[PDB]
Amino acid sequence: KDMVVMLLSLLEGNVVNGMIARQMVDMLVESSSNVEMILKFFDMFLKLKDIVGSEAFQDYVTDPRGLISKKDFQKAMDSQKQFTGPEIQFLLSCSEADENEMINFEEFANRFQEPARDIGFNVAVLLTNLSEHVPHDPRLRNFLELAESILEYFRPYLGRIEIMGASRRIERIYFEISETNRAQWEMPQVKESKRQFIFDVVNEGGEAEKMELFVSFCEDTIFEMQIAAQISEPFWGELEVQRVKFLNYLSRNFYTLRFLALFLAFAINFILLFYKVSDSPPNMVYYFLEESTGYMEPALWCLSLLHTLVAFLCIIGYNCLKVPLVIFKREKELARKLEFDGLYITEQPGDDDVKGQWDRLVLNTPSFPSNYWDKFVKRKVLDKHGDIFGRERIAELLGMDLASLEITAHNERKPDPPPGLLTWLMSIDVKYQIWKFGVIFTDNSFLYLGWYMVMSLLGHYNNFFFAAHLLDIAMGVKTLRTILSSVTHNGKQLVMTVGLLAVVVYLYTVVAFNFFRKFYNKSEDEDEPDMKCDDMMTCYLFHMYVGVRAGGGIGDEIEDPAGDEYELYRVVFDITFFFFVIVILLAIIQGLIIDAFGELRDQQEQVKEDMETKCFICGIGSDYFDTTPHGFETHTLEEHNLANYMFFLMYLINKDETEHTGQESYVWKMYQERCWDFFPAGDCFRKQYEDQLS
């Protein structure tokens, strides 16, 4: 592997049909016999690993101990028609036969799998690198054909991206994707987060911030994988292990608790359907359930108590699953605005930003980057803005002891961490918690869950308060949230057009109160008239309450103007009220809901069209790539896959900096400087070498 890594270093910044690439192909041909033996070593033990797991191999396994004899191994292996005569004999030699010719095939299959993985991957990278930079060499495909199983085995782990490299040219980078990283990326909640991010950027995002937003999404996604790993499952110590186990249980099953809370609400309300009011006990009235079973009244008590408990676990589960991401995102943005903008050093937001003003509380706290990983942002800000604004002023703002910086670099102290609850009491950062809770209490999802708390407790006061929890289906089912979004999309217009309806009706009220008061007798009695327009407040209430809801307008309710001196004036009163209010203004409400359905639908279509017609990374359209058959499908899956850019960043973060290659160091340096020029924009490997590749 160390020899191959040196060979790969010779290919850094290598163009298609380069001198070094074609020289390295010559060396492999010169040692073709040895290379084939190396390749035949890996495929023999890769094939062996899957063969022993096959059912056909298990047929020959007859020994109860789980072993197989050499003569039985011989007849089992050649029955698979995958090895030659000598190859089966070689495997017999490698098998550790006892004095009884008894073979332990379980350990035999796994003996060389782990040791040969690192070299096997680098051989796959080397052959892939050469095959893509010397694409017209006949002497190279035989190695590729002989390494077909090696290449096939490492295909899911061979990540490749393209960057605009140090040489002002598009370069292709090959790296390793770990099994855990791919497995976590394929998790259903991570995929849903990706879809939400893709929709936001394509729909309401700009091209200038696209890569900065994408990297920030990668960092947030990386943090979520850490949370998912922690909550996953395989006297103070006795309680602590169970407490974290309990909290992780709530975090893992947070959405099942949300579903069970919704089901608990429907069950309660179905019982509430049987409520009845009667004067007799089961001048004040009694409310009681009406049933013959007798089991429903105690059931409501049990269901009500259970519902409050489940909703409580939702708040705890939310605080352990979603809150850390919220605090991480807020700490991350504050840290970068401190360093790359000097928020509270230079600009000093002017009290109109509750987000910027509330973040002043955490600057001097000792535990400001609690969730955000960069625990040295205060050091970096001091080194960047300390000289021009004053080191002692920055240290005061960020709560840093300047005398303690050197001693930490001098040596490391190992104090006594006493496992006592008393010593834990003063170890909490009060000012940070007050800042953190203000961030949590301004989170919409937490506030909704907190609202779900208050109603649930109030349900024990009066069981009819549990009806409010039936509104959870707006958030419970994603479909209903889509229809409800078609109402709140033009919500600011909906309220305004209602306010316009209030003004227009008021003008009609003014006219009626001055000219048409005779027609507002709503009493069939002849001695006690019920004047509805002898007062402006009564007349205005009348027009809104009965005039708007009437099908034909105000003319439906007030008295018939037939044979009156103001007949023609009153008919104009009515058909204008009917046309403006009932016909036109209500049409505006209907049109706004209808328009939002079309507006939201095309947003989905626009996102799905942009994704399928342009590359998310480079921005080159599908028409250019489709010149080669299936060109756009290959480009988005292998060349400019946005998942591989996420995988590369995780690969860079875990890799030791002293082990970074020249290309990895180049990208890592630019990432640390928040410079995104390494992302290919308007260019790609296929375009740069159009002459050589074609």
Task: Write out the binding residues for Zn ion, residues 625-684 only, by CB under 5 A.
Answer: 640
Residue 539 or residue 650: which is nearer to ligand URA going by CB? Answer: 650
> Does 222 engage in binding with ligand URA (CB under 6 A)?
yes
Residue pair 636/615 in contact (Cβ under 8 Å)? The answer is yes
Region near a second copy per CB under 8 A, out of 26-34, 111-119, 136-144, 616-624: 616-624
200 counts as binding a second copy under rule CB under 8 A: no
From the CB of 170, what's the least distance to ligand ATP, in Å?
A: 15
653 binds, among ligand ATP, Ca ion, ligand URA, none (CB under 5 to 8 A by kind): ligand URA
DSSP notation for 119-139? HHHHHHHHHHHHHHHSTT-HH
Rule CB under 6 A: is residue 653 a binding residue for ligand URA?
yes
Check residue 164 for interaction with Zn ion (CB under 5 A). no
The CB-of-320 to ligand URA minimum distance in angstroms stands at 20
CA distances from 234 to 181, 189, 227, 230, 248 (A): 17, 20, 15, 10, 12
Site for ligand URA in 361-380 (CB under 6 A): 373
Contact (Cβ atoms closer than 8 angstroms) between residue 613 and residue 151: no
User: Concatenated DSSP letters for 368-403?
Assistant: TTSSSS-TTHHHHHHHHHHHHH-HHHHHHHHT--TT
Question: Residue 38, interface with ligand URA (CB under 6 A)?
Answer: no
Any contact of residue 562 with a second copy (CB under 8 A)?
yes
Tokens 């009965």 correspond to 546
Residue 185 is a binding residue for ligand URA (CB under 6 A) = no
User: At its nearest, how many Å lie between ligand ATP and the CB of residue 685?
Assistant: 14
Q: Shortest distance, CB of residue 663 to ligand URA, whole angstroms?
A: 18
Closest to ligand URA by CB, 222 or 458: 222
Minimum CB distance to ligand ATP smaller for 188 or for 417: 188
Residues 598, 62: Cα–Cα separation, whole Å: 67
The interface partner of residue 373, options being Ca ion, ligand URA, Zn ion, none and the CB cut-off 5 to 8 Å by kind, is ligand URA
What's the closest the beta carbon of residue 624 comes to ligand ATP, in angstroms? Answer: 13
Tokens at 474, concatenated: 């707006």
Nearest approach in angstroms of CB 44 to a second copy is: 16
**566 belongs to the binding site for a second copy (CB under 8 A):** no
| Binding flags for a second copy, 480-499, as an x/- string (CB under 8 A) | x-xxx-xx----xx--xxxx
Stretch that binds a second copy, among 53-61, 150-158, 183-191, 375-383 (CB under 8 A): 53-61
Least Å distance between CB 669 and a second copy? Answer: 18
Whichever of 145 and 612 has its CB closer to ligand ATP, that residue is 612
Q: Check binding of 632 to a second copy (CB under 8 A).
A: yes
Count of residues touching a second copy (by CB under 8 A): 112
CA–CA gap between residue 515 and residue 565 (Å, rounded): 11
If you write DSSP's letter for every residue of 451-518 in order, what string do you get?
HHHHHHHHHHH-GGGGGGGGGGHHHHSHHHHHHHHHHHTTHHHHHHHHHHHHHHHHHHHHHHHHH-GG
Binding residue per annotation — 641? Answer: yes
Token pair, residue 309, equals 């408990």
Q: Does 163 bind Zn ion (CB under 5 A)?
A: no
Which does residue 611 touch among Zn ion, Ca ion, ligand ATP, none (CB within 5 to 8 A, set by kind)? Answer: ligand ATP
Binding mask 651-680 for Ca ion (x = CB under 5 A): -------x----------------------
Pick one of 617, 646, 649, 650: the residue that binds Zn ion (CB under 5 A): 617
Q: Is 229 in the site for ligand URA (CB under 6 A)?
A: no
Q: Where are the alpha helices (DSSP H) in 583-641?
A: 586-613, 622-625, 631-634
Residue 11 or 215: the one with the smaller Cβ distance to a second copy is 215
- Compare residues 630 and 674 and give the one whose CB is closer to ligand URA: 674
Q: How far is the CB of 197 from a second copy (least distance, A)?
A: 17
SS3 175: strand
| End-to-end C-alpha distance for the chain, whole angstroms | 33
Using the minimum distance from each CB to Ca ion, give the nearer residue, 665 or 692: 665
Q: Is 528 annotated as a binding residue?
A: no
Q: Does 682 bind a second copy (CB under 8 A)?
A: yes
Nearest one of 524, 637, 509, 480 to 577, comparing CA atoms: 509
Nearer to ligand URA, 111 or 194 (CB): 194
As a three-state string, the secondary structure of 239-256 is: HHHHHHHHHHHHHHCHHH
Residues in contact with a second copy, shown as a per-residue x/- string from 541 to 560 under the rule CB under 8 A: x--xxx-xxxxxx-xx----
What is the x/- site pattern for Ca ion, positions 382-421, by CB under 5 A? Answer: ----------------------------------------
Residue type, 533: C
Using DSSP's 3-state secondary structure scheme, residue 523 falls into coil
Longest dimension (CA), the chain: 126
Which of helix, strand or coil describes residue 54? coil
Torsion angles phi and psi, residue 448, rounded to 5? -65, -45
Helix or strand holding residue 277 (H, E): strand 275-278
- Mention every residue, 6+ apart, whose C-beta is less than 8 A from residue 432: 362, 365, 366, 367, 368, 370
Q: What is the rounded distance in angstroms from the CA atom of residue 492 to the CA atom of residue 500?
A: 12
Q: Which residues bind ligand ATP (CB under 6 A)?
A: 611-612, 615-617, 636, 640-642
What does the alpha-carbon distance between residue 355 and residue 349 come to, in Å, rounded to a whole number?
10
Q: How far is the CB of 656 from ligand URA (least distance, A)?
A: 13
For residue 314, say whether it is annotated as part of any ligand binding site.
no
Distance of alpha carbon 372 from alpha carbon 335, whole angstroms: 9
How many residues of this chain interact with ligand URA, rule: CB under 6 A?
A: 4
Kindly provide the b/e burial profile for residues 114-140, where b requires at least 16 CB atoms within 10 angstroms of the residue's own CB. Answer: eebeebbbbbbbbbbbbbbbbeebeeb
Using rule CB under 5 A, residue 618 touches Zn ion: yes
Instruction: Find which of Ca ion, a second copy, ligand ATP, none residue 483 binds, CB within 5 to 8 Å per kind.
Output: a second copy
Q: Which of 40, 155, 601, 608 binds a second copy (CB under 8 A)?
A: 601
Please check if 460 is assigned to a binding site: no
- Alpha helices (runs of H) in 207-322, residue ranges in sequence order: 210-231, 236-252, 254-272, 296-321
Signed CA dihedral, 654, 657, 663, 669: sign only:
positive
CB 604 within 8 A of CB 493: no
- Asked whether position 109 contacts a second copy by CB under 8 A, the answer is no
Residue 140 site contact among Zn ion, ligand ATP, Ca ion, none (CB < 5 to 8 Å, cut-off depends on kind): none
Amino acid at 156: P
Q: What residues line the site for ligand URA (CB under 6 A)?
A: 219, 222, 373, 653
**Residues of the binding site for ATP:** 191-195, 611-616, 636-642
List residues binding Zn ion (CB under 5 A): 615, 617-618, 640
State the binding site.
191-195, 373, 611-616, 636-642, 658
What residues line the site for Ca ion (CB under 5 A)?
658
Sequence ranges of the binding site for Ca(2+): 658
Write out the binding residues for caffeine.
373
